[PDB]
């Protein structure tokens, strides 16, 4: 069981978002499905959800620009906003409206939790920037402390680039100890860096991979961890 | 919209309480939720309906409801449970989250922060820039301030510096840039990072001219 959300992560203003959750590992037959946003440093938004039979329940506040609709067969769920702005640059998330009995009292729903296993049932969220900048793919160049200790300290830098996000691995995710990916700033030309840093107490290669999906690049940087051999 | 504190404060160990405060409407006649986000991750739900929790979440989270204001509350506070919680109910037809609650555990050990200067490479400077990458790790608590210099001469133009951000250790980190032309990389004879944390500072330096 999976819900994973999918679509452009840059929107031109004015015109319409367009999301897919695809549901895996479960039937959209018997399972509401709804959609929430979170806005940069924003509380969480209720959009809407469309019920097992194809009824569907909006946000009074976007009513007027939303759209919800379900294909069973291809077990996806769509979201339509349109006329975006700026305010509608957020984190998208979809999840299930898992519904149960409570013997006393009646039927109650909760979003993100499945029906019957009570599992959690969360999409990993999908950040969708709206912005008239154009899609700038990132140059990525290799980090060396050199300019001898006992831990060594290289990395990538992830530079210039828009939109977020980047996803940075080290040897095809086989390193993770000693590994930390930096949040990204913005800087004045109006692109996003970020840095990849690994710590290690060497005897082994050190390549960084890179992935941009919305400019559709994947880049492979092999980092020379080696000092006084390089430049002498 | 549902009132949440925007903050609450709590030590290792000690139990802390967040406030969801609705009307007659939505949290008095419905179920109320709570949802958990970790900075790094999305959204999780800790526990449902009234006191029911999902698999996976432990038995320190617990909720319950007088009248029109549900509690979420933690027994025993560990550092993982720093994040941002959320609570949800329904009118009737509508679903309606809180603002939002940010939780700090103190109490934590204190640690420096590690820096490390990277010069600028030589593939960047074929493109006649240089960016100056300063790395900030292992520090809490999350507050450092940076501070770049060129000959013992600060610089306020040109830098951009992250807010601390929790790391994988459960303390934090950050990052500094400080992007130039080449050209203005080696017309100065050193460059240098200064990072002050709790009344502490910590100064790492790089030399174009030597390297």
């Known amino acids: 069981v999976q819900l994973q959300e999918s679509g452009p992560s840059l929107v031109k203003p004015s015109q319409t978002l367009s999301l897919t959750c695809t549901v895996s590992?479960?039937?959209?037959?018997?399972?509401?499905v709804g959609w929430i946003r979170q806005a940069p440093g924003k509380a969480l938004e209720w959009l809407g959800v469309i019920y097992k039979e194809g009824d569907k329940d909006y946000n009074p506040a976007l009513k007027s620009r939303l759209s919800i609709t379900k294909d069973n067969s291809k077990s996806q769920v769509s979201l339509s906003l349109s006329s975006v702005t700026t305010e509608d640059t957020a984190t998208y998330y979809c999840?299930?409206?898992?519904?149960?009995?409570?013997?006393?009292?009646?039927?109650?729903?909760?979003?993100?939790?499945?029906?019957?296993?009570?599992?959690?049932?969360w999409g990993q969220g999908l950040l969708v920037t709206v912005s008239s900048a154009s899609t700038t793919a990132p140059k990525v160049y290799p980090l060396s402390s050199c300019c001898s200790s006992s831990t060594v300290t290289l990395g990538c830098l992830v530079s210039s680039y828009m939109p977020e996000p980047v996803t940075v691995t080290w040897n095809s995710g086989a390193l993770k100890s000693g590994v930390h990916t930096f949040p990204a700033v913005l800087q004045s030309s109006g692109l996003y860096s970020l840095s990849s840093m690994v710590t290690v107490p060497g005897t082994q290669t050190f390549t960084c991979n890179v992935a941009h999906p919305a400019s559709s690049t994947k880049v492979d940087k092999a980092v020379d961890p080696r000092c006084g051999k390089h430049h002498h | 919209v549902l009132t949440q504190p925007p903050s609450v404060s709590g030590s290792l160990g000690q139990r802390v309480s967040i406030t969801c405060s609705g009307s007659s409407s939505n949290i008095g006649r419905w179920g109320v939720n709570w949802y958990q986000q970790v900075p790094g991750s999305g959204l999780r739900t800790i526990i449902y309906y009234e006191s029911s929790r999902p698999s996976g979440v432990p038995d320190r989270f617990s909720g319950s409801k007088s009248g029109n204001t549900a509690t979420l509350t933690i027994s025993s506070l560990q550092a993982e449970d720093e994040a941002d919680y959320f609570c949800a109910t329904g009118d009737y037809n509508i679903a309606v989250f809180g603002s939002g609650t940010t939780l700090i555990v103190m109490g934590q050990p204190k640690s420096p922060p590690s820096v490390t200067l990277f010069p600028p490479s030589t593939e960047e400077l074929n493109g006649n820039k240089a960016t100056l990458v300063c790395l900030i790790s292992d520090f809490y608590p999350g507050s450092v301030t940076v501070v770049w210099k060129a000959d013992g001469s600060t610089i306020t133009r040109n830098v951009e510096t992250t807010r601390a951000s929790k790391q994988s250790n459960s303390k934090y980190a950050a990052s500094s840039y400080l992007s130039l032309t080449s050209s203005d990389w080696k017309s100065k004879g050193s460059y240098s990072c200064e990072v002050t944390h709790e009344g502490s500072t910590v100064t790492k330096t790089v030399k174009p001219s030597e390297c």
């Open positions: 590992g479960l039937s959209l037959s018997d399972h509401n």
């Open positions: 999840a299930t409206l898992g519904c149960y009995f409570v013997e006393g009292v009646g039927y109650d729903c909760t979003y993100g939790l499945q029906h019957t296993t009570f599992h959690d049932a």
